DNA sequence: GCGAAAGACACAGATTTCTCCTTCGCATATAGGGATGCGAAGGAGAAATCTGTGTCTTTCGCAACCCTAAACC
């Protein structure tokens, strides 16, 4: 069943019937939801023309993982920026119809004298449903003007708005971006300075990760803990009755104040709305609730999965404030006493788990939603032991999200398949720097890091110090049968003096000398 | 003096100058026969640029009397020198640092194994953790070999005592197959299906596969010649 | 490189084109497929110059292209000549893509079809190239200039790293074979009897391998 | 220094920074406080009482040593610090620089991690901490 | 008369920066004591600039046209 045909069928069926409950139980709505649930959102292609330092480029994106490798002056970061622009438009239309997104500023156009405009082309695939978006901007004073094309994006966003309008537990895609400035964000220590209800539209405020989310993460954790305390308290319907009585008293006070203080009235209205939302949450609690204690243990266990050296995490109330307690070995520490690597790996996973939990209130296990995540400099503040295990944990904890990653280390590269590696090189074609993309020749999953450095990055895995020069000259002398020479003895004395006689390297050359000498003896006789 | 110091640190360039154009101004660097802008440099080059610039500025301002101000005395501490550096850059930073300023004392911490291969074994300390008398405390050790001029993985295995080869599931079949080839067993159906999996994941022409197949030919020729006479 | 054994001419569709047409771009896809079929048959699966693998054991395909030994602009009389065709890799820093942007005298180039390259070059264990001694001035000029134009003798990295890795990966077979030969000469046998057999076996085991000439040369020297 | 995460690689550098801070402060002016040890930096074990750092600086054949300490809470630390040696070096440098102009001074620098007068004549500052990835400020200075 | 796609117009509100307000500490010109006056840090609470939302504006190459000459709408 094609998604488009079901969408139009529901659209035409919607106009005739005016009763809402018939639509809410129609077979068309059920088919639309069923076909929308089992579809994987994923970008397909991307192209860039005259954007910043890039002249022309076309890139195809894998549906599971993609790694960009290479060094150059234009910088691999800019490609991620291009994708970030496109996704912003999709988010805006979901919030409200025909809301503007993010434009291309004039100073980002190429400064060459033979350019007039810059453009970005993207395509989004959803099973067999294809959409495309083009974003372009022309230089000042251009004879012809260019405009964006937003038919496909608005059409795709209309389906999400339509489904979310009738069912109150709809799921939405996830988009996020972690730049290299998160180290500063990960350095946040202490408050250095409480929403009653949390909705899925809260996260959609911004795309790029910044400092304020860490503060909000602490608040969310506190709320999650307090709700679980009620479950431990075994609160009965009397708590709901008391809340309803307090809501009625607040409504009576608001009515009295309405007669013979705009801020006070607004605060009273907000409090009444919060009480109504709490009452609706209590009503939803009878419908299997959500097991907030399970959510608390799910987030704690997911964080603990990346830190095997720690025992437990706890929230301790003291001095009229809440503090996080970390137990490592046989010691108790505060989050400000950790190293940089643990802070970064704590914040990244905490933010990802918070976003996924908030975005899918319906799913039994909310860590199986769809989305797209872009990460820059995956190997920040990590020792080689952790570098060889991050990928498996990332692609095993969240198995339905598409990752785009740039890296700089061969240890990370040796744990990914050769079909997900793209190498960027600069070619001075026709007296003009270009950008070409290539693939590794051989499979590099499971090989040593020397081979992954030689093939996946095209670099010599052996330095070129002066001692290596002495080694090469001596090896040439022995390999040329002319090892019996005064100069050879002079070089050999230096070699033994530096490396040492027990070194494994010297043994090989000595063996070569012995076999060659034998051959000479036999040939002479 | 600052410009000449930066030029001495990086000999791949020719000159650096500030140019006031008809409608703008920019800094121009010449390398080979190409003119480049200061803003076309990568993050690593900018980091090296500002590090050397600040070091030279301080050294010049601290020795106003010496004929060559780069011959002062002092101590410099660097933490995680390998931040935002391509592997080809990591293999030459130490020699330039220790050759531009030859009368200064350096204390450096690092994470990458590529940097280690260019450092002599006399000046490397390894921190471990052992428990003595029921109390866990840190200890300091030294490498057992000379790690100047060794390859990447030799330096990783010796200077850091970790595993250069990952523990992926795909490597398990390769290890099992090679072990089976040792105790002559390359006729069982289990070996045949493991060879099928290995040949499917890597390929016929993978160097590892060819090296594995080489042993079979060596044994076969061995018993052939042995039986011939 | 090695001495390429050119076979009887099989240009086929190349005969259809003539000088008046020129227009190398006008060649059809079927014509290119037929030419590649012949080139693969004659050349094996290795690059003409650097001997790097160009075709896998058939999604991504290794980049390859057709090269003319003589420049088209200066020697347009050989644009469609069969003897001027060659197959080259797509490496953007050596072989064909590097020959174009260089100034050289064509008359002083080594052609794999005419002369045997083994009389000039001699590879070593670590992957560098050594020019043989005793050659005339003209020969030394050709040997010294062909490496410079082809970028086949860099200071570090490039082709040398791959050649070294291939040799160190194939060193075990050489060590074992030379051990067997040494054992067989320590008991008693005819030198030419054992030598022919070991050489035949080694030659059989090194067919269709990357950089087969470097391992070839590294083999005789160790051999008694 | 080579090690894994959480193995005290940064602790050594911060220790040397505290050691050099007092020498620099005495160099600038006699009897000036340096930098102290934060309360949270003391060990969290039950039986700990105080923390101390000791150092030794060698100039040809001349030697000097310095020890700094702090107490957890109400315990009995090793009395007070020991700065007698550092004040002799500071006095020597002050005396040399007072009579003869354009003399020389030692250099002490520390390029830390993100975390977070001739110098005054042009633009520069006298601080021991400098941070990388600040290419804009160096560009404007140039 | 007015598709799609970017700006102008009107109305909130939010936030970092700064400028006025304690508080006691000092000081130095008059043989120690006391006093008129100024300097140092917190601690405000004010204000300019920026940002965000909702209603219009504009004017398409806009299924469905005739084929002889000139002028007008
Ligand atoms: N008050 C404390 N008591 C006990 N141990 C502490 C205390 N504060 C910190 N630690 C220990 O310090 C360790 C981290 O030390 P440190 O910052 O030197 O690590 P690092 O990995 O070398 O640092 P970096 O990444 O900054 O180079 C933690 O593992 C923790 O056990
Ligand atoms: Zn080639």
* β-strand pairing of A371-375 with A401-406: parallel
Rounded distance between C-alpha atoms, residue C184 and residue C164, angstroms: 30
A107-114: which pairs have CB atoms within 8 A and are 24 or more residues apart? A108/A51, A108/A52, A109/A50, A109/A51, A109/A137, A109/A139, A110/A50, A110/A51, A110/A52, A110/A53, A110/A55, A112/A50
* CA A498/CA A496 separation, integer angstroms: 5
User: Taking a C-beta distance cutoff of 8 angstroms, is the pair B144, B175 a contact?
Assistant: no
Give CA–CA dist D92/D105, Å, rounded. Answer: 11
Rounded Cα–Cα distance for residues B200 and A123 (Å): 33
For Cα atoms A316, A321, A326, give the angle at the middle one, nearest 5 degrees: 30
Rounded Cα distance between B79 and B51, Å, is 13
Let me know: does D89 contact D23? Beta carbons within 8 Å: yes
Q: Do you know the residue count of chain C?
A: 224
- What is the C-alpha separation between A166 and C15, in angstroms, rounded? 71
Residue of B nearest to C209 (CA): B205
Q: Which H/E stretch holds residue A41?
A: strand A41-51
The kind and range of the H/E element at B140 are strand B135-141
The CB of D5 under 6 Å from ligand 1? The reply is yes
Ligand 1 closest atom vs CA A381? 25
Nucleotide nearest residue A146, measured CA to C1': E5
Q: What are phi and psi of B79, to 5 degrees?
A: -115, 120
Cβ atoms of A369 and A363 closer than 8 Å: yes
Q: Do D5 and A332 touch (CB under 8 A)?
A: no
Closest approach of A200 to chain B, Cα-based (Å): 36
Return d(Cα A80, Cα A376) in angstroms, integer. 8
Distance CA C177, CA C158 (A): 30
3-state SS class at B196: helix
| Annotated binding-site members of B for ATP | 31, 40, 42, 45
**A69, closest residue in chain B (CA to CA):** B86
Alpha-carbon distance of A72 to A408, in angstroms, equals 12
Neighbour tally for A451: CB within 10 Å: 21
Do A392 and A196 meet the contact criterion of CB atoms below 8 Å apart? no
CB atoms within 10 A of CB B216: 12
E63 C1' – B44 CA distance, angstroms?
Answer: 62
Task: For residue A459, give the nearest of B40, B88, B95 by CB distance.
Answer: B88
**A90 exposure class (CB count in 10 Å sphere: 0-12, 13-18, 19+):** buried
How far, in Å, are A159, B10, B88, C205 from residue B13 at the CA level? 57, 7, 17, 49
Check if A499 contacts B (Cβ < 8 Å). yes
Q: Where do we find the tokens 């061969």?
A: A410
**Do A26 and A12 touch, CB atoms closer than 8 A?**
no
* Phi and psi based region of residue A112 (left: phi greater than 0; alpha: psi -120 to 50; beta: remaining): beta
The alpha carbon of A77 is separated from its chain's Cα centroid by a whole number of angstroms, namely: 14
Q: Which residue has the tokens 């602009």?
A: C73
For residue C47, report the distance from its CA to the centre of ligand 2, in Å.
Answer: 5
Set of chain B residues whose Cβ sits within 8 Å of the Cβ of D10: 79, 109
Q: Distances from the Cα of A143 to the Cαs of A103, A134, A138, B222, in angstroms?
A: 20, 20, 9, 81
Of B49, B77, B124, the CB nearest to D2: B124
Pairing of strands C85-89, C121-123: unpaired
For residue B225, the chain C residues in CB contact (below 8 A) are: 180, 184, 197
Chain B nearest-CA distance from A369, in A, is 27
The residue among B78, B43, B161, B145 whose CA lies nearest residue B113 is B161
Round to a whole number and report the distance in Å from the CA of A146 to the C1' of E72: 40
| Ligand 2 centroid, distance to C146 Cα (angstroms) | 14
- Between CA B10 and CA D94 the distance in angstroms is 37
Closest Cα to residue D20, out of A215, A68, B105, A48?
A: B105
Which residues surround strand E, with CB < 7 Å?
A 96, 100, 103, 147-151, 154
The CA–C1' separation of D137 and E38, in angstroms, is 38
Distance CA C57, CA B205 (A): 8
Nucleotides of E under 7 A from a protein CB: 4-7, 54
Element (H, E) at A254: helix A237-258
Q: Do D109 and B76 touch (CB under 8 A)?
A: yes
Question: Which of C126, C171, C173 should one mutate to test binding to chain B, selecting the residue with the greatest count of B CBs within 10 A?
Answer: C173
Residue C13 DSSP SS3: helix
Distance CA C58, CA A60 (A): 22
Work out whether strand D107-111 and strand D129-130 pair parallel, antiparallel, or are unpaired.
parallel
Query: Ligand 2: distance of its center to the CA of A451 in Å?
Result: 20
Residue closest to A174 by CA, chosen among A91, A113, A283, A246: A91
3-state secondary structure of A6: helix
Per DSSP, the residues of A414-464 read: TTS-GGGEEEEE--EETTEE--EEE--SS--SSS-HHHHHHHHS---SS--
* Closest-approach residue (CA) in chain D for A385: D4
How far apart CA A227 and CA A330 sit, in angstroms, is: 30
Atom of ligand 1 nearest to the CA of D7: 22
CB pair distance less than 8 Å for A436 and C92 = yes
Q: Whose CA is nearest to atom 29 of ligand 1?
A: D6
Whether the CB of A476 is below 8 Å from some CB of chain C: the reply is yes
d(CA A435, CA A74): 10
Separation of alpha carbons B1 and B14, rounded Å: 16
C111 Cα: distance to centroid of ligand 2 (angstroms): 15
User: Which atom of ligand 1 lies closest to the CA of D11?
Assistant: 18
- The answer to whether A142 contacts chain C (CB < 8 Å) is no
DSSP D2: B
Distances (CA, A) of A367 to A312, A373, A395: 21, 14, 12
B34 token code pair: 């190409």
DSSP letter, residue C53: B
Question: Nearest CA to CA, how far is B205 from chain C (Å)?
Answer: 8
CA D88 to chain centre: 17
As a whole number of angstroms, the distance between CA C145 and CA A6 comes to 71
CB A418 within 8 Å of CB A387: no
Q: How far is CA C126 from CA A411, A458, A503, D40, D94, in A?
A: 26, 18, 18, 56, 60
Residue of A nearest to C128 (CA): A476
Question: Which phi and psi (to 5°) does residue C98 adopt?
Answer: -105, -25
Q: Report how this structure was experimentally obtained.
A: cryo-EM
3-state secondary structure of A56: strand
Q: What's CA B126's distance to the chain center, in Å?
A: 17
How long, in residues, is chain D?
Answer: 142
What's the rounded Cα separation, in Å, for the pair A304 and A349? 10
Instruction: Select from B214, B222, B225 the Cβ nearest to the Cβ of C173.
Output: B214
Residue with structure tokens 């560098």? Answer: C128
Tokens of B147: 């790690």
CB-ligand 1 contact for D91 (6 Å cutoff): no
Q: Is B74 helix (H, G, I), strand (E, B) or coil?
A: strand
- Minimum distance, in Å, between the CA of residue A243 and any CA atom of chain B: 54
- Collapsing DSSP states into helix, strand and coil, what is residue B195? helix
Q: Which residues contact C81 (CB under 8 A, 6 or more apart)?
A: none
Tell me which long-range contacts C37-45 makes (C-beta under 8 A, separation of at least 24): C38/C10, C38/C12, C39/C66, C39/C85, C39/C86, C39/C87, C40/C87, C42/C4, C42/C5, C42/C6, C42/C7, C43/C4, C43/C87, C44/C208, C45/C208
| Alpha carbon distance A324, A350 (integer Å) | 14
As a whole number of angstroms, the distance between CA B2 and CA B49 comes to: 11
Q: Does A181 touch chain C (CB under 8 A)?
A: no
Owner of token pair 């069923």: A34
Alpha carbons A118 and A310: distance in angstroms, whole number:
51
How many other CB atoms sit within 10 Å of the CB of residue A352? 22
Going by the annotation, the residues of the binding site of D for ATP are 6-11, 40, 42, 44
């Amino acid at each position: 069943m094609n998604l488009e045909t079901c969408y139009v069928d529901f659209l035409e069926l919607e106009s005739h019937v005016i009763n809402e409950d018939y639509l809410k139980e129609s077979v068309e709505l059920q088919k639309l939801i069923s076909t929308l649930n089992e579809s994987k959102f994923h970008l397909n292609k991307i192209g860039i023309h005259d954007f910043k330092r890039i002249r022309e480029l076309q890139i195809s994106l894998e549906d599971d993982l993609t790694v960009f490798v290479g060094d150059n002056g234009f910088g691999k970061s800019t490609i991620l920026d291009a994708i970030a622009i496109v996704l912003s438009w999709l988010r805006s239309n979901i919030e409200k119809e025909s809301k503007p997104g993010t434009y291309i500023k004039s100073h980002e156009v190429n400064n060459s004298v033979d350019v007039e405009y810059a453009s970005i082309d993207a395509n989004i695939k959803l099973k067999d449903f294809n959409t495309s978006i083009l974003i372009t901007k022309a230089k000042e004073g251009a004879y012809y003007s260019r405009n964006n094309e937003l038919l496909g994006v608005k059409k795709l966003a209309s389906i999400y708005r339509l489904v979310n309008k009738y069912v109150d537990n709809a799921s939405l895609p996830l988009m996020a971006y972690y730049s290299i400035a998160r180290s500063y964000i990960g350095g946040g220590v202490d408050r250095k300075r409480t929403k009653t209800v949390w909705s899925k539209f809260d996260v959609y405020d911004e795309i790029e990760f910044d400092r304020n989310d860490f503060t909000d993460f602490f608040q969310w954790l506190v709320f999650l803990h307090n709700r679980a305390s009620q479950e431990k308290l075994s609160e009965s319907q009397t708590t709901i009755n008391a809340l309803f009585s307090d809501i009625q008293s607040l409504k009576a006070t608001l009515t009295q104040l309405s007669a013979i203080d705009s801020t006070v009235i607004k605060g009273l209205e907000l409090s009444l709305k919060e009480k109504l939302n709490y009452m609706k949450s209590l009503q939803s609690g009878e419908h299997k609730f959500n097991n907030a204690v399970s959510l608390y243990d799910s987030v704690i266990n997911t964080i603990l999965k990346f830190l095997p050296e720690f025992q437990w995490i706890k929230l301790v109330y003291g001095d009229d404030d809440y503090k996080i307690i970390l137990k490592k070995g046989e010691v108790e520490l505060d989050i400000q006493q950790l190293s940089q690597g643990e802070k970064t790996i704590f914040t990244l996973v905490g933010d990802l788990a918070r976003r996924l939990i908030l975005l899918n209130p319906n799913l039994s296990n909310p860590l199986l939603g769809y989305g797209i995540v872009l990460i820059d400099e995956i190997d920040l503040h990590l020792h080689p032991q952790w570098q060889q295990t991050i990928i498996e944990r990332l692609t095993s904890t969240f198995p339905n999200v598409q990752f785009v990653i740039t890296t700089h280390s061969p240890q990370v590269l040796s744990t990914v398949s050769s079909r997900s590696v793209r190498i960027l090189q600069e070619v001075e074609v026709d007296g003009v720097n270009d950008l070409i993309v290539s693939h590794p020749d051989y499979q590099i999953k499971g090989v040593s890091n020397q081979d992954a450095l030689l093939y996946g990055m095209r670099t010599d895995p052996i330095p070129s110090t002066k001692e290596n020069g002495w080694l090469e000259e001596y090896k040439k002398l022995v390999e040329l049968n002319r090892y019996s020479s005064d100069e050879a003895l002079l070089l050999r004395e230096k070699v033994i003096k530096h490396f040492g006689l027990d070194h494994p390297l010297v043994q090989e050359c000595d063996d070569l000398i012995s076999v060659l000498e034998f051959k000479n003896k036999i040939n002479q006789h | 003096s600052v410009i000449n110091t930066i030029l001495k640190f990086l000999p791949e360039f020719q000159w650096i100058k500030l140019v006031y154009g008809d409608d703008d101004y920019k800094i121009i660097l010449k390398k080979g026969e190409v003119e480049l802008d200061i803003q076309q440099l990568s993050q690593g080059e900018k980091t090296i640029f500002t590090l050397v610039g600040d070091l030279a500025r301080r050294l010049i301002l601290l020795n106003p009397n010496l004929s060559n101000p780069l011959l002062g005395y002092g101590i410099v501490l660097i933490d995680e020198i390998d931040l935002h550096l391509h592997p080809q850059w990591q293999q030459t930073i130490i020699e330039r640092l220790t050759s531009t300023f030859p009368n200064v004392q350096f204390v450096i911490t690092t994470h990458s194994p590529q940097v280690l291969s260019t450092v002599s074994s006399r000046s490397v300390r390894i921190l471990q953790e052992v428990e003595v008398d029921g109390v866990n405390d840190l200890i300091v050790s030294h490498p057992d070999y000379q790690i100047k001029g060794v390859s990447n993985q030799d330096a990783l295995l010796y200077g850091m005592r970790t595993d250069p080869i990952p523990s992926t599931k795909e490597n398990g079949w390769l290890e099992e197959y090679k072990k089976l080839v040792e105790l002559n067993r390359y006729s069982s159906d289990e070996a045949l299906l493991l060879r099928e999996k290995v040949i499917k994941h890597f390929g016929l022409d993978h160097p590892l596969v060819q090296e594995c197949d080489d042993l079979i030919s060596v044994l076969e020729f061995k018993n052939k010649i042995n039986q011939h006479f | 490189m090695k001495y390429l054994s050119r076979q009887m001419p099989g240009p086929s569709v190349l005969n259809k084109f003539d000088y008046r047409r020129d227009d190398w771009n006008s060649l059809s896809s079927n014509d290119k497929k037929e030419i590649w079929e012949e080139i693969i048959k004659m050349q094996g699966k290795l690059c003409a110059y650097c001997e790097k693998k160009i075709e896998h054991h058939k999604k991504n395909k290794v980049e390859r292209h057709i090269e003319h030994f003589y420049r088209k602009s200066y020697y347009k009389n050989l644009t469609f000549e069969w003897s001027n065709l060659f197959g080259s890799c797509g490496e953007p820093q050596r072989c064909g893509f590097y020959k174009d942007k260089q100034k050289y005298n064509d008359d002083d180039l080594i052609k794999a079809d005419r002369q045997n390259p083994d009389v000039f070059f001699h590879f070593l264990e670590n992957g560098d190239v050594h020019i043989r001694e005793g050659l005339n001035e003209k020969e030394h000029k050709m040997a010294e200039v062909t490496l410079r134009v082809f970028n086949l003798n860099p200071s570090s990295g490039g082709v040398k790293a791959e050649r070294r890795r291939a040799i160190e990966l194939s060193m075990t077979l050489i060590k074992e074979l030379v051990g067997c030969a040494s054992q067989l000469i320590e008991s008693g046998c005819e030198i030419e009897d054992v030598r022919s057999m070991v050489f035949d076996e080694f030659k059989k085991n090194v067919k269709d391998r990357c950089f087969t000439t470097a391992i070839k040369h590294v083999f005789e020297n160790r051999m008694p």
